[PDB]
Amino acid sequence: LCPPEAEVQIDRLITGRLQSLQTYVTQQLIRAAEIRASANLAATKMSEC
Amino acid sequence: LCPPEAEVQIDRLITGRLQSLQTYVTQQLIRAAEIRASANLAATKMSEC
Question: What's the gap in Å between the CA of A1 and the closest CA on chain B?
Answer without folding.
Answer: 23
